[PDB]
Amino acid sequence: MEQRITLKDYAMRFGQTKTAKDLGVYQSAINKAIHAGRKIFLTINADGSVYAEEVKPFPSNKKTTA
Amino acid sequence: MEQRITLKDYAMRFGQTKTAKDLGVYQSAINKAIHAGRKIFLTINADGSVYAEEVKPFPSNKKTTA
């Protein structure tokens, strides 16, 4: 079991204040992350753990299949 | 244990012209990815296929996991 949600879906659907309180970062760090609109996923474990990671295929533009 | 080479080891040990030919990208795209050193790995599927991806933890570098 493990709650997997994007940093923007957990901060927007639950609140950036709680996403920054669980990750420790400040609201300016969670807002800057959403500002980069990059691949920032959030791997929260049932133990109230927050494991945000970054994963984006290169390059940034262009289009390819997985 | 697939072939995992960094975009810098495949473009420097083989050439940025060949690495861009497998990923079908621009030479300035592999040069900017190497200049940003944003954890850009190059996974070459055993089928001679290429799959460059990005992967970095948040925020800077998790010191202790859980």
Query: Measured between CA atoms, how close is A8 to chain B, in angstroms?
Result: 14
Asked how this structure was determined, the answer is: NMR
User: Cβ of A57 and B53 within 8 Å?
Assistant: yes
Q: Which of B58, B41, B59 is nearest to B50 (CA)?
A: B41
Entry field: residues in chain A: 66
Number of structural domains chain B divides into: 1
In the sheet that holds A49-57, the strands lie side by side as A3-6, A40-45, A49-57, B49-57, B40-45, B3-6
Whether A56 has its CB under 8 Å from any CB of chain B: the answer is yes
Query: Two tokens at A2?
Result: 């493990």
- B27: domain CATH number is 3.30.240.10
* Residue B2 belongs to domain spanning: 1-66
Query: Measured between CA atoms, how close is B65 to chain A, in angstroms?
Result: 8
* Cα separation values, B36 from A21, A66, B33, B40, B50, Å: 30, 24, 5, 9, 20
Contacts of B40 in chain A (CB under 8 A): 58
Backbone angles phi, psi at B5, to 5 degrees: -125, 140
